[model samples]
Target chain A: ENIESELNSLRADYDNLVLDYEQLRTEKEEMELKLKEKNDLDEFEALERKTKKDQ
Target chain B: IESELNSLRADYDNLVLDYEQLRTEKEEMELKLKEKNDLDEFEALERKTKKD
Candidate 1:
């Protein structure tokens, strides 16, 4: 019984770790997406200027 | 098994610290972007007037 209880506690700890890791990863991805969008707009504007100059 | 759990705990603690730092940075960037967007809108309006 003691061994079983220890195993369950370890399982719970592992599960919690996985959950927190996933949540952090998701937040990181979202932040990256937001920054990427901002960068894309800047790139687009630069391209527009180059196009105008060519014409 | 004990060593494994200890290592995992250390990793989890580091991740928590990293997450906090990233969250702070993300919030700051969001505010800056919001300000930039407002300025961009104003500049766009100015450019429209100049063109007209």
Candidate 2:
């Protein structure tokens, strides 16, 4: 059916767009989390040095 | 309708198996990548951490 063909194409496009969007989002979130963890570690180390200085 | 149903079931089963295989392959690749300590551009930060 001609209608079916159009529907299939629309569906394929929609699915691809969704997958690409999700993949990019997931990668961004993962990278952001990793960066945050590293920053947190650095901050903790700095605080630890300050504490050691006080004591 | 019955024939169509059977065909759909077959397709579903085939797809399920294929999806499982793909998942297994992805897991295997991740494990291998972990063990090899190979570096990719995305891994630059982690590698720098390891180097220092």
Candidate 3:
């Protein structure tokens, strides 16, 4: 009975955290990959502009 | 029994750290992506106007 309730509350919070961690991890990784693609596209467009200017 | 509580506390803190780190990086990435997309769209519209 001593501190048992506190332990239960901590355990419950941890369970919720587990789900949040997983969901955030998935979205974070996805965004990282998408960011790379976006950066690449931006550079490509920049180069295209330079090529036209040179002509 | 006290140790169990301590262990759970550590675990919870670690997960919080991990989650916040990812959240910050994800937000920064979103901001950069938005800026890039805006630039790209602006260039495309500039081209369209020149043709007409």
Candidate 4:
């Protein structure tokens, strides 16, 4: 007799936590990529300025 | 029979709770890792800015 749990109450909590986890993961990845892009842009700009100064 | 069913339900709930706790801990670890990476990046940026 596998009984049904108060699964209804716990299921929502479980789902909410999972949703929160997924959202945080996605946010972290997006921010990391943006930071990388910004850093690369800064590097490129610096290189351009140095080249202009030399010329 | 009803008592047995209730016991099984309680066991299932315990398992679910354990799994959720593990998932939460894993997520916390990953969040910490991301924080560390960002801190490193900021430190690198600060060093470069200071050099200039």
Q: Where is model 4 more than 4 Å wrong at Cα? A: A1-8, B1-52
What do the candidate models score in CA lDDT, each in turn?
Answer: 0.74, 0.60, 0.86, 0.67
Q: After superposition, how far is residue A50 of candidate 4 from its true place, in Å?
A: 1.7
Per-residue lDDT of model 1, residues B1-52, tens digit only: 6656566667666766876786787677677668668877999999999999
What TM-score goes with each of the models?
0.48, 0.43, 0.72, 0.41
The two-chain DockQ for each candidate, comma-separated, is: 0.16, 0.05, 0.67, 0.09
TM-score of chain A of each: 0.73, 0.70, 0.74, 0.66
Per-residue lDDT of model 2, residues A1-55, tens digit only: 6655655555565566556555655655555565556668769989999999999
Query: Which one is best on DockQ?
Result: 3
Give the TM-score ranking, best first.
Answer: 3, 1, 2, 4
Which tens-of-lDDT digit does each residue in A1-55 have in candidate 4?
1333545544556577667757666765665666667678779989999999999
For DockQ, candidate 3 versus 4, the one ahead is 3
CAPRI docking class of candidate 3: medium
Instruction: List, in order, the clash count of every candidate structure.
Output: 0, 0, 0, 0
**Candidate 3, B3-50: lDDT as tens digits:** 889988998999888888888988998887787678789989999999
Minimal lDDT window, size 10, model 2 chain A: A23-32
Given candidate 2, what's the lDDT at residue A35? 54
For model 3, the superposed segments whose C-alpha errors exceed 4 Å read: A46-55, B39-52
Residue A50, model 3, lDDT: 100
